[PDB]
Structures are given as structure tokens and as C-alpha cells.
Amino acid sequence: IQRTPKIQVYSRHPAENGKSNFLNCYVSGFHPSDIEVDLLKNGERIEKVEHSDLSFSKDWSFYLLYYTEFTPTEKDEYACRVNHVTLSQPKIVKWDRDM
Amino acid sequence: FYAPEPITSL
Amino acid sequence: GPHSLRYFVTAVSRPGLGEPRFIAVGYVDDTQFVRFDSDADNPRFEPRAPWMEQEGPEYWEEQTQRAKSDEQWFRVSLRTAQRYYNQSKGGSHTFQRMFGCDVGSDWRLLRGYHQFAYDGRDYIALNEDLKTWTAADTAALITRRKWEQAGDAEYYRAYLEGECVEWLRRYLELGNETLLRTDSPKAHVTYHPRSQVDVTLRCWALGFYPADITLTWQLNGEDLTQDMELVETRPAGDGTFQKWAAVVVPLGKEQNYTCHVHHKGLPEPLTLRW
Structure with a gap:
């Protein structure tokens, strides 16, 4: 049986322009463990994005943290793109400073 | 410390 | 411990x-x-x-x-x-x-x-x-x-x-x-306009370790009847964790809501009003 991933996009430290932060995409509660995760700057795929080691929770559902260093600006939009067997098409969640 | 080598099979 | x-x-x-x-x-x-x-x-x-x-x-x-x-x-x-x-x-x-x-x-x-x-x-x-x-x-x-x-x-x-x-x-x-x-959480409330009658209140807990935390809202002191959003605790990336809890409250009524935070690193639980 399958579980659809939960997705959260957010910064390590709170967001202020010009300061080097870390951009996170935390995908959790999903099964099975095969998952596609990309970080997007202005709709384009960021290149050296790293992730945590595969682990899972008490209910056996998996979780991963995808992250990359970046410097947020006034203009630049960011997002996380996730594809998974449970999703009939790639889900895109935009980075919101307040969420 | 990882668990010791399995002794019985599934 | x-x-x-x-x-x-x-x-x-x-x-x-x-x-x-x-x-x-x-x-x-x-x-x-x-x-x-x-x-x-x-x-x-x-x-x-x-x-x-x-x-x-x-x-x-x-x-x-x-x-x-x-x-x-x-x-x-x-x-x-x-x-x-x-x-x-x-x-x-x-x-x-x-x-x-x-x-x-x-x-x-x-x-x-x-x-x-x-x-x-x-x-x-x-x-x-x-x-x-x-x-x-x-x-x-x-x-x-x-x-x-x-x-x-x-x-x-x-x-x-x-x-x-x-x-x-x-x-x-x-x-x-x-x-x-025990890294205590740094907590604060944020304010986000919704419609012309409602508004979103979001209570944040940041920078805390360990990951177990208790984060809620209450109206005048009793538990909520509405529909609070409480997201999964999530890793900040540096060994600390984050969480928030949000409620949709009537405009003009924001002062009847408090955010409470209990954590192992808090000698006193937090109580936040906006």
C-alpha cells in the first residue's frame, strides 16, 4: 500500500534578503521510498542539492531532507518539485517566507 | 552498536 | 535523563x-x-x-x-x-x-x-x-x-x-x-490577511532540541473548536527543529487567542498574544 508525501518548503534561518541561508524541502510520511525531489530557482532545477540519509518514522513511513545553500533576493522565486508514485503529476510547492 | 549477525531466516 | x-x-x-x-x-x-x-x-x-x-x-x-x-x-x-x-x-x-x-x-x-x-x-x-x-x-x-x-x-x-x-x-x-x-524554542506569532472578515494567526517555534514539543492555540482559555493547522515538526538542517500552529480568527477578535509552548528547554511554558 502507498502513502502520498507531505511537503514543506522553508529556510533554515528566517528569511532576509542578501543573507546566505539554506533552502529546505522536507518530504515525509511517504511510501514507498522511491521519490524525486528537485529544488527550483525561477522554475529551473538547482544543481548540487544534497539530501539526508533515508530514514523512517514509527509508522514505517519515510522522510528525507533536501537542502542547498543559497542567498535569497527580493526578486528570485524558489520552489520544491516532488514526483512520486502516489502523485499523478509532479507537485510543485512554492517557497513562502511566512510558511 | 549495530545488532549482531542474524541467526534465523525469514 | x-x-x-x-x-x-x-x-x-x-x-x-x-x-x-x-x-x-x-x-x-x-x-x-x-x-x-x-x-x-x-x-x-x-x-x-x-x-x-x-x-x-x-x-x-x-x-x-x-x-x-x-x-x-x-x-x-x-x-x-x-x-x-x-x-x-x-x-x-x-x-x-x-x-x-x-x-x-x-x-x-x-x-x-x-x-x-x-x-x-x-x-x-x-x-x-x-x-x-x-x-x-x-x-x-x-x-x-x-x-x-x-x-x-x-x-x-x-x-x-x-x-x-x-x-x-x-x-x-x-x-x-x-x-x-536542551535548546529552547524561540517563539513568535505572525499575522497574515486572508479575506475581508477573517485573518490567519501563525505561532512559530524555532531552533529547539530535542524535537518533541507541544504547540497549541486556545480561545479565552478553553480548547479550540475551529480547525487548527499544526504542521509536522521539521528539521532546520543544523540539528534543531521547527514547528508552527495556525488558526483562522475573526477580525477584531485576535486578542482572545493565545499561543502556548511547552518544551523541555523552557523553565516556563510560553504564552504568546499578538
């Missing part, structure tokens, strides 16, 4: 692509400290926390060899599992193991784990008495039957009560600087 040592092990069969995916991660409380990745260029247990980098080669070689041995067991178990159920060959499947020990403040084994899941569902688990087994279904009954006769319970109880707890003690020593800390 209470502490735990946990391993989370995953094996995914990939037909036509080669041997299965095999990964094991090790945690002390909410801090990861070791790993094994079968796809790594060189398959070996390696440290994933700064305080583990001092250990000798004997430590790493024994860890690596116990993991490689477990990996082999998982290859057979995936095949055996697929046969037990009569599933179609060629498909991809998952096997998971979680094991380790929880100790209380009197250095006493509160709970020892040795349990398995197949395809995301419970398969077999060592009961709390460390002597008996819980089978999830008639397939697992076959396995329970074999493990009962072979005495696997006693074999892992010996591990759970000995090596596991003994090395939990050592890990807590190695990383006392970081593991025994």
Missing part, C-alpha cells in the same frame, strides 16, 4: 537493476550518528556525527561487517517474503527493520526493539517482554514459528540488554557537549 539508541534499516528490491537498495541509519535520540549505503562507492559504516570520528578501525570494521551480514539476510528475506504471499515476480518491494533500546533515568531498559515491516505494513515484532513475538498475519506466523524454535528472542534480548545499552552509554559520553543539551 531518558535516552534512546535506534537503527532504521531499509531494503528495496529492484529487479533488472541489480541487487536491492540497502541502507541503515543510526540515531541517538534525535541526532543521527552513523550510516551504511550500499550504493556508495565504498560500502562501509561511516560516522554522520562529529563526535564519532575518533573511533578506531576495529569499531568501524565490526559495524560494517554486521551490516553487510544483515544486508545479505534482507536479500533472502525479500525473496522469501514474495514467495510467502504469492506476489508477482519482477515487482519492487520494501523491507524495513527497526531495532534498539530506550532507557529511563535509572539506566534501565524501558523498551527493547526488534521489529520488521514488509511493503510498509507491520510484519513481525518482538514484544515488550523480550521473549515473545507478534505476527501480523499467517505468513508471519511461519516466521514466528521458526524464530520461536531457534530462540531468536533470547539472542536479541542479550544484545538489547547488553551491547545496545552499553554503547548507548558510550555515545552519550562521546557527544555530551551536544547530546545532553
Whole structure:
């Protein structure tokens, strides 16, 4: 049986322009463990994005943290793109400073 | 410390 | 104080692509400290926390060899599992193991784990008495039957009560600087316009360790009847965690709402009004 991933996009430290932060995409509660995760700057795929080691929770559902260093600006939009067997098409969640 | 080598099979 | 040592092990069969995916991660409380990745260029247990980098080669070689041995067991178990159920060959499947020990403040084994899941569902688990087994279904009954006769319970109880707890003690020593800390959450409320009558209030808890936290809103003091959003606790990326809880409140009525925060690093619980 399958579980659809939960997705959260957010910064390590709170967001202020010009300061080097870390951009996170935390995908959790999903099964099975095969998952596609990309970080997007202005709709384009960021290149050296790293992730945590595969682990899972008490209910056996998996979780991963995808992250990359970046410097947020006034203009630049960011997002996380996730594809998974449970999703009939790639889900895109935009980075919101307040969420 | 990882668990010791399995002794019985599934 | 209470502490735990946990391993989370995953094996995914990939037909036509080669041997299965095999990964094991090790945690002390909410801090990861070791790993094994079968796809790594060189398959070996390696440290994933700064305080583990001092250990000798004997430590790493024994860890690596116990993991490689477990990996082999998982290859057979995936095949055996697929046969037990009569599933179609060629498909991809998952096997998971979680094991380790929880100790209380009197250095006493509160709970020892040795349990398995197949395809995301419970398969077999060592009961709390460390002597008996819980089978999830008639397939697992076959396995329970074999493990009962072979005495696997006693074999892992010996591990759970000995090596596991003994090395939990050592890990807590190695990383006392970081593991025994309580980083209190930094909390604040944010205000976000919705419609022309409603508004969103979001209560944030940031920078805290360990990951367990209690975050809620209440109206005038009694519990909520509305529909609060409370997102999953999430890793900041630096060893700390974040969470928020939000409620939609009537404009003009914002002052009847308070956010409460309870955490092990807070000598007093927080109460936040906007």
C-alpha cells in the first residue's frame, strides 16, 4: 500500500534578503521510498542539492531532507518539485517566507 | 552498536 | 535523563537493476550518528556525527561487517517474503527493520526493539517482554514459528540488554557537549490577511532540541473548536527543529487567542498574544 508525501518548503534561518541561508524541502510520511525531489530557482532545477540519509518514522513511513545553500533576493522565486508514485503529476510547492 | 549477525531466516 | 539508541534499516528490491537498495541509519535520540549505503562507492559504516570520528578501525570494521551480514539476510528475506504471499515476480518491494533500546533515568531498559515491516505494513515484532513475538498475519506466523524454535528472542534480548545499552552509554559520553543539551524554542506569532472578515494567526517555534514539543492555540482559555493547522515538526538542517500552529480568527477578535509552548528547554511554558 502507498502513502502520498507531505511537503514543506522553508529556510533554515528566517528569511532576509542578501543573507546566505539554506533552502529546505522536507518530504515525509511517504511510501514507498522511491521519490524525486528537485529544488527550483525561477522554475529551473538547482544543481548540487544534497539530501539526508533515508530514514523512517514509527509508522514505517519515510522522510528525507533536501537542502542547498543559497542567498535569497527580493526578486528570485524558489520552489520544491516532488514526483512520486502516489502523485499523478509532479507537485510543485512554492517557497513562502511566512510558511 | 549495530545488532549482531542474524541467526534465523525469514 | 531518558535516552534512546535506534537503527532504521531499509531494503528495496529492484529487479533488472541489480541487487536491492540497502541502507541503515543510526540515531541517538534525535541526532543521527552513523550510516551504511550500499550504493556508495565504498560500502562501509561511516560516522554522520562529529563526535564519532575518533573511533578506531576495529569499531568501524565490526559495524560494517554486521551490516553487510544483515544486508545479505534482507536479500533472502525479500525473496522469501514474495514467495510467502504469492506476489508477482519482477515487482519492487520494501523491507524495513527497526531495532534498539530506550532507557529511563535509572539506566534501565524501558523498551527493547526488534521489529520488521514488509511493503510498509507491520510484519513481525518482538514484544515488550523480550521473549515473545507478534505476527501480523499467517505468513508471519511461519516466521514466528521458526524464530520461536531457534530462540531468536533470547539472542536479541542479550544484545538489547547488553551491547545496545552499553554503547548507548558510550555515545552519550562521546557527544555530551551536544547530546545532553536542551535548546529552547524561540517563539513568535505572525499575522497574515486572508479575506475581508477573517485573518490567519501563525505561532512559530524555532531552533529547539530535542524535537518533541507541544504547540497549541486556545480561545479565552478553553480548547479550540475551529480547525487548527499544526504542521509536522521539521528539521532546520543544523540539528534543531521547527514547528508552527495556525488558526483562522475573526477580525477584531485576535486578542482572545493565545499561543502556548511547552518544551523541555523552557523553565516556563510560553504564552504568546499578538
